[PDB]
């Protein structure tokens, strides 16, 4: 059983529990990223998280992002699937579900400092190292991750990414 949900730091036990479990997966799958730093972003009022759920409560993966509506782009802060569930197509399904939602939120671009060890995954998701969207849009807005490479993905406006 695999579902999806978009979580917000709204102060309820329900979202909090899901968010905490997602945060734990990020730090495990991202040893070098300080948990304190992960917590700072995941629980920040401007960040939302979409998670992959099993049996509607077990978090096996997710994507934490910040939508910049005026510029029509979304910064992907963290992305991960728990080790034991990786390489099964869940990361691809999560991204397609994320693209679908961004498309409905009027977001045209996705930016992210992709982990040097996962650039291959992002390329397979349509991200490129080439900057195409006006750079003044993101410069000074997105966080720079040390061991990451800036990558971007254009959201096709009317294609069906999932449903």
């Amino acid at each position: 059983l695999l579902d999806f949900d978009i979580l917000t730091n709204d102060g309820t036990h329900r979202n909090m529990k899901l968010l905490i479990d997602l945060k734990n997966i990020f730090s495990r799958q991202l040893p070098k990223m300080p948990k304190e730093y992960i917590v700072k972003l995941v629980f920040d009022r401007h960040h939302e998280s979409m998670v992959i759920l099993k049996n509607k409560q077990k978090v096996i993966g997710g994507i934490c992002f910040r939508q910049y509506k005026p510029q029509r782009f979304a910064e992907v802060a963290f992305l991960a699937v728990t080790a034991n569930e990786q390489v099964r197509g869940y990361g691809t399904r999560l991204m397609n579900k994320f693209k679908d939602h961004m498309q409905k939120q009027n977001i045209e671009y996705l930016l992210t400092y992709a982990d040097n060890f996962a650039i291959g995954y992002f390329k397979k998701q349509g991200f490129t190292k080439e900057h195409r969207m006006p750079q003044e849009k993101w410069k000074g807005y997105i966080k720079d991750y040390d061991g990451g490479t800036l990558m971007e993905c254009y959201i096709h406006p009317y294609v069906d990414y999932g449903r």
Partner: peptide
Amino acid sequence: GGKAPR
């Protein structure tokens, strides 16, 4: 951040 991983 140190984008390291897995």
